[PDB]
Ligand binder design. Structure first.
Ligand code: ZN
Length: 199
């Protein structure tokens, strides 16, 4: 696969709308589906399972705002390599009828989801309309699904990745950015507790 000639910025930018991310406070019981470590800024999740990510703003972005998610390798020497699904999963029969079979990150439960293969940078990304929080709610939740394990040979192959979440206006202008590390693994709860053990 062709390397990208560029690397997306991962610099945090709250912007005019005071944009940042939140995650459920899920703990590390062995049963948890998805769990986020504030100390590591790292989400631990399972293949193809719901991964809630919260959008928090201080003021409401204008109508037509969109929310984009994109993965990059965390290690500088792999950064120009496009993060994609391994050949095995690229060929498996788990299509949801909306997502490209090579894309690592999907969004579930949203029929307005849109996927992009960037024709210049080669990066994959997934975008949904920004929706303000339901009345009485403090944030907007997106349900992401990661469609390969961190260990997948011929794919991520045990290399750490970051998900970059950006807010953009209807014309593509950057309004906000935040990011977090992701490990897609068999037992998120155990793995988080173990990785934090090294602190
Ligand atoms: Zn895979």
């Amino acid at each position: 696969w062709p390397l990208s000639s560029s690397v997306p910025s991962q610099k945090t930018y709250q912007g005019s709308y005071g944009f940042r991310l939140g995650f459920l406070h899920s703990g590390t019981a062995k049963s948890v589906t998805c769990t986020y470590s504030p100390a590591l800024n790292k989400m631990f999740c399972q293949l193809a399972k719901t991964c809630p990510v919260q959008l928090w703003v201080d003021s409401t972005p204008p109508p037509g705002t969109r929310v984009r998610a994109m993965a990059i390798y965390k290690q500088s020497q792999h950064m120009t390599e496009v993060v994609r699904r391994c050949p095995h999963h690229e060929r498996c029969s788990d299509s949801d009828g909306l997502a490209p079979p090579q894309h690592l990150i999907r969004v579930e439960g949203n029929l307005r989801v849109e996927y992009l293969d960037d024709r210049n940078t080669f990066r994959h990304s997934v975008v949904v309309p920004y929706e303000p929080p339901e009345v009485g709610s403090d944030c907007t939740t997106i349900h992401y699904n990661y469609m390969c394990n961190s260990s997948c040979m011929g794919g991520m192959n045990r290399r750490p990745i970051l998900t970059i979440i950006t807010l953009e206006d209807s014309s593509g202008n950057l309004l906000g950015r935040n990011s977090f590390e992701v490990r897609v693994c068999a037992c998120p709860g155990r793995d988080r507790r173990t990785e934090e053990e090294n602190l």
